[PDB]
Every structure is written in C-alpha cells, then in structure tokens.
Short mmCIF file of C-alpha atoms in Angstrom, two decimals:
data_model
loop_
_atom_site.label_atom_id
_atom_site.label_comp_id
_atom_site.label_asym_id
_atom_site.label_seq_id
_atom_site.Cartn_x
_atom_site.Cartn_y
_atom_site.Cartn_z
CA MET C 1 91.16 79.46 121.43
CA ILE C 2 88.34 81.16 119.53
CA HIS C 3 84.69 80.15 119.87
CA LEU C 4 81.74 80.73 117.57
CA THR C 5 80.24 83.85 119.18
CA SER C 6 77.32 86.03 118.10
CA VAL C 7 77.92 89.78 118.00
CA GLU C 8 74.56 91.17 119.02
CA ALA C 9 73.31 94.24 120.79
CA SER C 10 72.80 93.72 124.53
CA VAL C 11 70.07 95.99 125.89
CA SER C 12 69.52 96.47 129.63
CA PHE C 13 67.72 98.73 132.10
CA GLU C 14 70.32 99.70 134.67
CA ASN C 15 70.92 102.53 137.19
CA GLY C 16 68.14 104.70 135.80
CA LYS C 17 68.76 105.04 132.08
CA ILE C 18 67.92 102.42 129.44
CA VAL C 19 71.29 101.11 128.32
CA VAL C 20 72.97 99.23 125.50
CA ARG C 21 76.46 97.86 125.00
CA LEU C 22 77.89 97.36 121.57
CA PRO C 23 81.18 95.93 120.14
CA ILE C 24 83.46 98.28 118.26
CA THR C 25 86.01 95.71 117.24
CA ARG C 26 84.03 93.07 115.39
CA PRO C 27 82.20 94.40 112.28
CA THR C 28 78.89 92.76 111.36
CA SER C 29 76.15 93.22 108.80
CA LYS C 30 74.34 95.07 111.59
CA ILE C 31 76.99 96.87 113.58
CA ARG C 32 80.33 98.38 112.62
CA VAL C 33 82.28 101.59 112.91
CA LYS C 34 82.28 104.13 110.11
CA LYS C 35 83.86 107.54 109.83
CA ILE C 36 81.74 110.34 108.41
CA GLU C 37 83.39 112.28 105.60
CA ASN C 38 81.22 114.66 103.54
CA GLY C 39 77.69 113.64 104.51
CA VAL C 40 78.44 109.92 104.05
CA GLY C 41 80.63 107.53 106.03
CA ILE C 42 83.25 104.85 105.35
CA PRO C 43 84.28 101.83 107.48
CA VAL C 44 87.16 102.27 109.87
CA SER C 45 89.32 99.72 111.62
CA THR C 46 89.13 100.53 115.31
CA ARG C 47 92.20 98.39 116.04
CA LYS C 48 94.83 99.53 113.52
CA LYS C 49 95.17 103.29 114.06
CA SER C 50 94.31 105.26 117.23
CA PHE C 51 91.26 107.57 117.25
CA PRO C 52 91.72 111.37 117.53
CA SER C 53 92.03 113.08 120.91
CA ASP C 54 89.10 115.39 120.03
CA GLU C 55 89.90 117.21 116.76
CA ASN C 56 87.37 115.13 114.82
CA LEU C 57 86.39 112.32 117.14
CA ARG C 58 82.74 113.35 116.59
CA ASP C 59 83.13 112.22 113.02
CA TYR C 60 83.45 108.58 114.16
CA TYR C 61 80.23 106.77 114.83
CA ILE C 62 78.72 103.32 115.30
CA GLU C 63 76.28 102.38 112.61
CA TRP C 64 73.74 100.01 114.09
CA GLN C 65 71.20 98.34 111.83
CA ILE C 66 68.64 98.23 114.56
CA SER C 67 65.39 96.26 114.45
CA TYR C 68 62.23 95.77 116.53
CA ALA C 69 61.45 92.01 116.53
CA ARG C 70 63.67 88.90 116.61
CA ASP C 71 61.11 86.45 115.24
CA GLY C 72 57.43 87.29 115.54
CA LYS C 73 58.26 88.29 119.10
CA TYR C 74 58.56 91.96 120.04
CA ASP C 75 61.53 91.91 122.43
CA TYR C 76 64.43 92.54 120.07
CA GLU C 77 66.71 95.61 120.36
CA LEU C 78 64.37 98.59 119.94
CA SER C 79 61.13 96.84 120.89
CA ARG C 80 62.90 95.84 124.08
CA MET C 81 64.43 99.22 124.84
CA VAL C 82 60.87 100.54 124.71
CA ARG C 83 59.18 97.86 126.84
CA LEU C 84 61.77 98.49 129.50
CA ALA C 85 61.59 102.28 129.30
CA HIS C 86 57.80 102.21 129.41
CA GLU C 87 57.96 99.65 132.17
CA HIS C 88 60.29 101.84 134.25
CA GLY C 89 58.51 105.11 133.55
CA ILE C 90 61.29 106.45 131.30
CA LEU C 91 58.68 106.32 128.59
CA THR C 92 55.43 107.97 129.65
CA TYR C 93 51.87 107.03 128.69
CA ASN C 94 51.62 110.38 126.95
CA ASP C 95 54.82 109.73 124.99
CA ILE C 96 53.37 106.50 123.58
CA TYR C 97 50.14 108.44 123.16
CA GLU C 98 51.69 111.13 120.98
CA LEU C 99 53.36 108.45 118.85
CA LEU C 100 50.10 106.57 118.43
CA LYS C 101 48.59 109.96 117.63
CA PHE C 102 51.40 110.60 115.17
CA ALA C 103 50.86 107.12 113.67
CA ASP C 104 47.14 107.68 113.12
CA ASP C 105 47.99 111.00 111.45
CA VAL C 106 50.27 109.65 108.71
CA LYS C 107 49.56 108.21 105.27
CA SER C 108 52.67 108.83 103.18
CA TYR C 109 55.68 106.61 103.64
CA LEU C 110 59.22 106.04 102.40
CA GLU C 111 58.12 102.89 100.63
CA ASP C 112 55.89 105.25 98.72
CA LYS C 113 58.72 107.17 97.06
CA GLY C 114 59.53 103.77 95.53
CA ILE C 115 62.73 102.69 93.86
CA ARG C 116 62.79 103.89 90.30
CA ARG C 117 64.90 103.52 87.17
CA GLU C 118 64.53 106.50 84.89
CA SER C 119 65.96 107.01 81.46
CA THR C 120 68.01 110.12 81.00
CA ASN C 121 68.24 110.94 77.33
CA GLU C 122 72.00 110.92 77.06
CA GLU C 123 74.01 107.84 76.12
CA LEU C 124 77.45 106.40 76.77
CA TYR C 125 79.21 105.26 73.59
CA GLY C 126 76.07 103.92 71.99
CA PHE C 127 74.78 102.69 75.30
CA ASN C 128 71.53 104.08 76.64
CA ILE C 129 72.22 105.03 80.21
CA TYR C 130 69.71 105.28 83.08
CA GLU C 131 69.75 106.11 86.81
CA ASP C 132 68.37 103.98 89.58
CA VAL C 133 66.96 106.21 92.26
CA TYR C 134 66.88 105.09 95.87
CA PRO C 135 65.11 107.21 98.50
CA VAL C 136 66.72 107.78 101.86
CA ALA C 137 65.62 109.78 104.91
CA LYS C 138 67.99 111.03 107.59
CA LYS C 139 67.41 112.99 110.84
CA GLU C 140 69.81 114.19 113.46
CA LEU C 141 69.17 114.50 117.18
CA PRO C 142 70.59 117.54 119.04
CA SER C 143 73.07 115.34 120.94
CA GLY C 144 74.71 114.20 117.72
CA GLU C 145 73.23 110.86 116.71
CA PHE C 146 71.30 110.44 113.47
CA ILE C 147 68.61 108.07 112.17
CA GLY C 148 68.65 106.72 108.63
CA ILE C 149 65.87 104.99 106.71
CA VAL C 150 66.58 103.14 103.46
CA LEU C 151 64.67 101.07 100.95
CA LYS C 152 65.57 97.68 99.40
CA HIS C 153 64.00 95.51 96.67
CA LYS C 154 62.52 92.64 98.74
CA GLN C 155 65.26 89.94 98.63
CA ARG C 156 63.36 86.83 97.54
CA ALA C 157 59.98 88.40 96.27
CA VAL C 158 57.98 91.41 95.27
CA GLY C 159 57.93 94.59 97.32
CA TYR C 160 60.38 96.52 99.44
CA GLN C 161 62.45 96.49 102.64
CA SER C 162 62.48 99.59 104.81
CA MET C 163 65.54 99.40 107.03
CA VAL C 164 65.88 101.73 110.04
CA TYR C 165 69.45 102.65 110.86
CA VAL C 166 70.82 104.48 113.86
CA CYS C 167 74.27 105.88 114.44
CA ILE C 168 75.78 107.04 117.67
CA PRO C 169 79.13 108.92 117.63
CA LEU C 170 82.08 107.73 119.62
CA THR C 171 81.81 110.94 121.63
CA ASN C 172 78.50 109.73 123.03
CA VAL C 173 79.79 106.43 124.37
CA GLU C 174 81.54 104.95 127.35
CA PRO C 175 84.43 104.62 127.48
CA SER C 176 86.04 107.26 125.27
CA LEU C 177 88.42 105.97 122.56
CA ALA C 178 89.90 109.45 122.40
CA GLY C 179 93.59 109.21 121.55
CA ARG C 180 93.83 105.41 121.73
CA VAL C 181 92.90 102.18 119.95
CA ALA C 182 90.23 99.63 120.63
CA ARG C 183 90.85 96.77 123.01
CA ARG C 184 90.69 93.22 121.60
CA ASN C 185 87.03 92.74 122.44
CA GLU C 186 86.06 96.18 123.57
CA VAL C 187 82.40 96.93 124.07
CA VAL C 188 81.00 100.36 124.90
CA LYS C 189 78.09 101.72 126.86
CA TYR C 190 75.57 104.16 125.44
CA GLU C 191 72.74 105.61 127.53
CA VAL C 192 69.54 105.94 125.55
CA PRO C 193 67.49 109.19 125.44
CA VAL C 194 63.71 108.90 125.05
CA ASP C 195 63.68 111.17 122.04
CA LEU C 196 66.19 108.85 120.36
CA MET C 197 63.92 106.05 121.47
CA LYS C 198 60.86 107.94 120.21
CA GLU C 199 62.45 108.89 116.89
CA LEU C 200 63.45 105.31 116.17
CA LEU C 201 59.79 104.28 116.60
CA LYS C 202 58.63 107.25 114.62
CA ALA C 203 61.22 106.46 111.92
CA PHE C 204 59.48 103.15 111.39
CA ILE C 205 55.95 104.56 111.38
CA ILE C 206 56.80 106.73 108.40
CA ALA C 207 59.00 104.03 106.87
CA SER C 208 56.17 101.96 105.39
CA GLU C 209 52.53 101.20 106.19
CA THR C 210 53.54 97.70 107.23
CA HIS C 211 56.17 98.73 109.75
CA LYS C 212 53.63 101.21 110.97
CA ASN C 213 51.06 98.45 111.63
CA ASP C 214 53.58 96.70 113.82
CA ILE C 215 54.85 99.77 115.63
CA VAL C 216 51.21 100.73 116.12
CA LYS C 217 50.38 97.24 117.38
CA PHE C 218 53.39 96.93 119.67
CA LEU C 219 52.79 100.35 121.20
CA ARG C 220 49.08 99.82 121.70
CA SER C 221 49.57 96.51 123.42
CA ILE C 222 51.98 98.08 125.91
CA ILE C 223 49.06 100.08 127.30
CA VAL K 7 76.32 75.06 88.05
CA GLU K 8 78.31 76.90 85.35
CA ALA K 9 77.17 77.38 81.74
CA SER K 10 78.37 75.06 79.02
CA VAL K 11 79.41 76.96 75.91
CA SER K 12 79.62 74.78 72.82
CA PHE K 13 79.58 75.05 69.05
CA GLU K 14 76.70 73.49 67.13
CA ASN K 15 76.05 73.78 63.41
CA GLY K 16 77.57 77.16 62.57
CA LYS K 17 76.50 78.96 65.74
CA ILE K 18 77.79 79.51 69.28
CA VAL K 19 75.46 77.63 71.65
CA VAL K 20 75.10 77.82 75.44
CA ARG K 21 73.22 75.65 77.92
CA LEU K 22 71.98 77.35 81.09
CA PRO K 23 70.93 76.06 84.56
CA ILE K 24 67.55 77.73 85.31
CA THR K 25 67.29 75.45 88.34
CA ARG K 26 70.13 76.50 90.65
CA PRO K 27 69.52 80.13 91.86
CA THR K 28 72.80 82.04 92.11
CA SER K 29 73.90 85.67 91.82
CA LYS K 30 75.45 84.66 88.51
CA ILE K 31 72.73 82.95 86.51
CA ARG K 32 69.13 82.76 87.70
CA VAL K 33 65.59 82.81 86.32
CA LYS K 34 63.43 85.89 86.81
CA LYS K 35 60.11 87.54 85.91
CA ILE K 36 58.86 91.12 85.70
CA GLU K 37 56.28 91.96 88.36
CA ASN K 38 56.19 95.72 87.88
CA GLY K 39 59.72 97.10 88.06
CA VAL K 40 62.75 94.84 87.81
CA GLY K 41 62.26 91.08 87.73
CA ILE K 42 61.83 89.01 90.86
CA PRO K 43 63.14 85.49 91.55
CA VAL K 44 61.21 82.53 90.18
CA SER K 45 60.87 79.24 92.07
CA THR K 46 61.52 77.03 89.01
CA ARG K 47 60.89 73.69 90.70
CA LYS K 48 57.73 74.89 92.47
CA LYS K 49 55.31 77.02 90.44
CA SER K 50 54.89 75.90 86.83
CA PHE K 51 55.56 78.45 84.08
CA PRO K 52 52.63 80.64 82.87
CA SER K 53 51.30 79.70 79.43
CA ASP K 54 49.43 82.90 78.47
CA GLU K 55 50.79 86.43 78.07
CA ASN K 56 52.97 86.21 81.21
CA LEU K 57 55.65 84.00 79.71
CA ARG K 58 57.06 87.27 78.27
CA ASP K 59 58.02 88.55 81.60
CA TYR K 60 60.10 85.48 82.27
CA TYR K 61 63.79 85.46 81.38
CA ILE K 62 67.19 84.26 82.51
CA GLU K 63 69.21 86.96 84.18
CA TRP K 64 72.81 85.90 83.85
CA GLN K 65 75.53 88.08 85.31
CA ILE K 66 78.06 86.95 82.72
CA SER K 67 81.82 87.24 83.11
CA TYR K 68 84.94 86.82 81.01
CA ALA K 69 87.34 85.15 83.43
CA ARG K 70 87.92 82.74 86.34
CA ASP K 71 91.08 82.81 88.46
CA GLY K 72 92.18 85.14 85.72
CA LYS K 73 91.79 82.52 83.05
CA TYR K 74 90.28 84.03 79.92
CA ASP K 75 88.41 80.94 78.71
CA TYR K 76 85.35 81.33 80.90
CA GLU K 77 81.90 81.97 79.37
CA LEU K 78 82.25 85.13 77.26
CA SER K 79 86.01 84.72 76.73
CA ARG K 80 85.26 81.10 75.90
CA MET K 81 82.46 82.13 73.49
CA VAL K 82 84.83 84.55 71.77
CA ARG K 83 87.81 82.23 71.21
CA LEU K 84 85.34 79.57 70.20
CA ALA K 85 83.70 82.18 67.97
CA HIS K 86 86.95 83.15 66.28
CA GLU K 87 88.05 79.59 65.55
CA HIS K 88 84.88 78.67 63.62
CA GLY K 89 84.94 82.08 61.96
CA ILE K 90 81.64 83.43 63.37
CA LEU K 91 83.62 86.37 64.75
CA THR K 92 85.98 87.53 62.00
CA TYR K 93 89.46 88.85 62.54
CA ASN K 94 87.93 92.00 61.15
CA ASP K 95 85.21 92.21 63.76
CA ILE K 96 87.73 91.88 66.56
CA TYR K 97 89.79 94.66 65.05
CA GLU K 98 86.77 96.96 65.05
CA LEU K 99 86.04 96.22 68.72
CA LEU K 100 89.66 97.06 69.28
CA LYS K 101 89.21 100.33 67.37
CA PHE K 102 86.13 101.04 69.49
CA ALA K 103 87.84 100.27 72.78
CA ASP K 104 90.39 102.85 71.69
CA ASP K 105 87.84 105.67 71.44
CA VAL K 106 86.22 104.96 74.81
CA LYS K 107 87.80 107.41 77.25
CA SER K 108 84.84 107.50 79.61
CA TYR K 109 83.33 104.63 81.63
CA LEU K 110 80.03 104.00 83.40
CA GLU K 111 81.88 103.69 86.70
CA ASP K 112 82.90 107.32 86.25
CA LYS K 113 79.35 108.56 86.79
CA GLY K 114 79.97 107.32 90.32
CA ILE K 115 77.26 106.92 92.94
CA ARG K 116 75.79 110.00 94.47
CA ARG K 117 73.34 111.18 97.00
CA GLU K 118 71.42 114.37 96.32
CA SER K 119 69.25 116.21 98.86
CA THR K 120 65.76 116.51 97.40
CA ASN K 121 64.81 119.55 99.46
CA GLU K 122 61.74 117.70 100.63
CA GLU K 123 60.82 116.40 104.03
CA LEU K 124 58.68 113.60 105.37
CA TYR K 125 57.18 113.72 108.84
CA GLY K 126 60.30 115.48 110.08
CA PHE K 127 62.81 113.40 108.15
CA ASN K 128 64.68 115.15 105.36
CA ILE K 129 64.42 113.04 102.21
CA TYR K 130 67.28 112.41 99.78
CA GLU K 131 68.14 110.28 96.76
CA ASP K 132 71.03 107.91 96.09
CA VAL K 133 71.60 107.48 92.38
CA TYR K 134 73.20 104.48 90.71
CA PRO K 135 74.15 104.84 86.97
CA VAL K 136 72.93 102.03 84.73
CA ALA K 137 73.43 101.42 81.01
CA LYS K 138 71.51 99.10 78.77
CA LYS K 139 70.99 98.09 75.20
CA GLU K 140 68.14 96.13 73.74
CA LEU K 141 68.49 93.86 70.73
CA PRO K 142 65.90 93.37 68.00
CA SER K 143 66.03 89.69 68.93
CA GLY K 144 64.91 90.27 72.53
CA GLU K 145 68.10 90.27 74.60
CA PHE K 146 68.57 93.03 77.16
CA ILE K 147 72.23 93.61 77.94
CA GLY K 148 72.51 96.04 80.82
CA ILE K 149 75.39 96.94 83.06
CA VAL K 150 75.14 98.49 86.50
CA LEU K 151 76.87 98.74 89.87
CA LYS K 152 76.62 96.13 92.63
CA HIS K 153 78.57 94.94 95.68
CA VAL K 158 82.41 96.46 100.48
CA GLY K 159 81.99 99.29 98.01
CA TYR K 160 80.74 98.92 94.45
CA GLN K 161 82.14 97.45 91.23
CA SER K 162 80.68 97.51 87.66
CA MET K 163 78.79 94.37 86.63
CA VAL K 164 77.58 93.33 83.17
CA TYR K 165 74.48 91.17 83.06
CA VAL K 166 72.31 89.91 80.26
CA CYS K 167 68.75 88.64 80.05
CA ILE K 168 67.18 86.15 77.65
CA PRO K 169 63.41 85.99 77.24
CA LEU K 170 62.57 82.35 78.04
CA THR K 171 60.77 82.28 74.73
CA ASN K 172 64.21 82.53 73.06
CA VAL K 173 65.27 79.27 74.72
CA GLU K 174 64.53 75.60 74.05
CA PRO K 175 62.55 73.68 74.73
CA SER K 176 59.23 75.48 75.13
CA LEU K 177 58.99 75.34 78.93
CA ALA K 178 55.57 76.98 78.56
CA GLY K 179 52.99 75.50 80.94
CA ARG K 180 55.02 73.24 83.24
CA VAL K 181 57.74 72.95 85.90
CA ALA K 182 61.46 72.26 85.35
CA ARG K 183 62.80 68.71 85.74
CA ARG K 184 65.52 67.79 88.31
CA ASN K 185 67.92 70.35 86.92
CA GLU K 186 66.58 71.13 83.48
CA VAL K 187 69.19 73.12 81.64
CA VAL K 188 68.03 75.15 78.66
CA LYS K 189 69.85 75.69 75.37
CA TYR K 190 70.37 79.14 73.92
CA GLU K 191 71.64 80.03 70.46
CA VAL K 192 74.00 82.97 71.07
CA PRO K 193 73.54 85.66 68.37
CA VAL K 194 76.89 86.98 67.15
CA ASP K 195 75.55 90.42 67.91
CA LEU K 196 75.15 89.57 71.62
CA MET K 197 78.85 88.77 72.01
CA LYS K 198 79.84 91.97 70.27
CA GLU K 199 77.65 94.10 72.49
CA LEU K 200 78.74 92.16 75.62
CA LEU K 201 82.28 92.77 74.61
CA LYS K 202 81.62 96.47 74.10
CA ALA K 203 79.83 96.54 77.47
CA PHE K 204 82.83 95.43 79.52
CA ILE K 205 84.83 97.81 77.40
CA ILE K 206 82.64 100.65 78.68
CA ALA K 207 81.98 99.43 82.25
CA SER K 208 85.40 100.57 83.48
CA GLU K 209 89.08 100.97 82.65
CA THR K 210 90.25 97.72 84.19
CA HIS K 211 87.36 95.95 82.60
CA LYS K 212 88.39 97.60 79.36
CA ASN K 213 92.11 96.94 79.63
CA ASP K 214 91.25 93.28 80.21
CA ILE K 215 89.03 92.85 77.12
CA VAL K 216 91.65 94.80 75.21
CA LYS K 217 94.64 92.62 76.21
CA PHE K 218 92.49 89.53 75.57
CA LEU K 219 91.27 90.48 72.10
CA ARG K 220 94.71 91.72 71.10
CA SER K 221 95.68 88.20 72.16
CA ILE K 222 93.34 86.24 69.93
CA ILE K 223 94.78 88.03 66.92
CA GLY K 224 98.40 88.73 65.98
CA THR K 225 98.72 91.57 68.49
#
C-alpha cells in the first residue's frame, strides 16, 4: 500500500561526525546511482543486478544534486551540514575564516566561461554545423568523492544556473552493497569530512558571483 | 494546443498558438545568446527595433503515435495533393536521402579537458553538435540534441514579423493564434533536416516519402 513519499536527503549530527542518509533504490532528479565508465557515469539499477564484491565497486557512486537553501532559508542539505558542523566544532572558526578569505580573493567564476555556440567552418550535407560549448568543473577528494559544477541556461529567463553536484562512491557508505543487491527501500549512511564540506562551499563560491554572495552571507552570519 | 495546417489559396498555411508555452511550440526573443521565453499575455510586444528578436520556436515533428499525418507529414501530403510539392521534388529528396551516410547524431556528445583550472577545480567542456540553415525569407531551421540520454530534435523559428496579424505594440488575446504562410522551401529543408538528424529519423522520412509516391 504505497504512499506519496518525498525522497530527500536527511542530514543529522550524530555520534561525532556530521551524517547524512540517502536512498539508493529510488532515483530522483537530485539523487540516483550512476556507474562511472571512462570519466563519465551512467545510471544503474541498484535492484536488478548485484554490485561487485570489490573488483570495481569504487566505480559505483551516488550522484547527489546538493543545494544550500530550501526556500530563502539557509537550512537545506549543505547549509545545514555546515551549521551543525560549525555548531559542534567540527567546523572551526578558522575554517570558515579561510573560506571567507578565499571568497574575498576570487573574481572569476564558472558562469563567466559562459555557454557558447560557435560555428565551425565545416558543414553536414549542406547544413552549417555548430557546437554548443558547456563549461564544467570537477574536483576529486583524496578519499574518492568528487565535486561537479555545471552551467544551465536559466529555465524561465535570462542568465545561468550554476549547479553544484557531489558524488560519493558506494565504497564510502554504510552499509556496503558489495556482492549483493539493494533492499526495497535501502538507505545508506555517509559520514561527512570537513574538507568535503569545505569544498562544497568553495565549489559554490567559484561557481558564480551570486552563489558566492550567498555562501559569503551564510558563512559570515554563522560567526 | 497543436498547430492547424491548412491549405489556402495556392499555399500551405499554418496557425500557431503563441499563447500556450510548451516544449513543442512557444514564443521567444533573443536577449544576447539564444532566445528566452516570452510572457505573451503579460508584457506587450515591443514596437521598435526589438520586434526582430521575437520569433516562434516550434520543435516540429512528423508523427504522432506513429501516424504520419501530423504537422510536417501533414504539410507534405497536403502539399503533394495541391501540387505545391511536385512528384519530382519528392524524388529529389529521396535521391538526397540516399547520399546521406552521415548524421548529426554521429558527432555524438563529448567532454574535453581544457587543461585549465579555476580556483583548484579543473575545467572542462561538454560539446553538443548543432546544425542550422537560414533562409532568405527569415526562417532559421536548426537541429540539435536534447533530452534519459539524448535524441536529435529538429526545430524551426519564425520571425514574428513573418506572421499575421502585426502583433507589434500590444498583448495577445485569450489565446491568439497566428497564421503563417509556409514557404515550400521550408518544408524541403525541414524534410532534409530529419533526413540528416539520424538514421531512424532518416529511414522514417524515407519510408514516408516513398509512400506518397508510387514507391
């Protein structure tokens, strides 16, 4: 007897580390499970075929389209992982300081690269072909996770949409799907490192001078 | 609301929505790069040199359910009947379709690693292959890739100026539909477009044309 249920990211501060639990069996426009194959990943169905017992399990990750505000309020996903962390000392004054420093010392963003359509000079059967160029910026933490920043033509208006993305490999989550399949409504636990936390905030700062403003306003306020 | 393709006085005519925004037929305007949505029932149309940035972007198609009498396919059959699109012309397009051995979709979509870096983050570029064709008359008939995964999509644009009445300087009524006189060239290039977008897309247009003539 199914009920309308929202698949969101649940962030908590438990037994020391800042934590988050995520579903791995209900794909959304924000979460889902892709397999990395040649620098880019494809969607996988965690319930049809059992994950590898190690020989590539690091290739499977959870792509989470993370954000930092639900609606004008700064207590959504990231913004909340931070508040907590700062609140419980996981995130030090200095940490926030260096970011704010970092912020101040930035003036080139991803929204600067722009999205451009350039004419090559070749042509397909009489048809003048071009190439639309979209900028993307990745980064990978030692542990294995990687941050992605993308740009989108502002849905219903003029401008852009910098979208921070994070991905944490199945090898970095609890439990370990090694050699099995996902359970009907399986959720996993992922402890969050400050660097990861710090990079996600940094990732926005360089993403676009708007996002910066916010990240610089959120962080200042928490002082 | 769909488009209504009719025949009026020796020309293929089409009446378009311009008041019901949908990823199939909407009204746009050029801000700097590609055109952005236009709130037709809110802000009245510009009456000076802006009007030339306004146009109807209509992701046209040639089937519904798999019924080849939708929009383009309609236009064609309706174009053959009244002789605006000769048996000859359809044979040429067939000849053409035969030569085409390469499709836009073959370029694929790739990501290259500009060996640059931004505040620690390695930059890269994802490249989507487009293909256009302007017409003396004013119609832009491009074809690109859109949404999981990507499929080739032919769209067309029509400078508002090329539509009746002269909306210049006012807002659209309840659901003011505009009328557009479809230039026989347009159809030909639209046909060629699907023929080049991809194999399936080709094979369709091919089976369909071969159908409206003895083949």
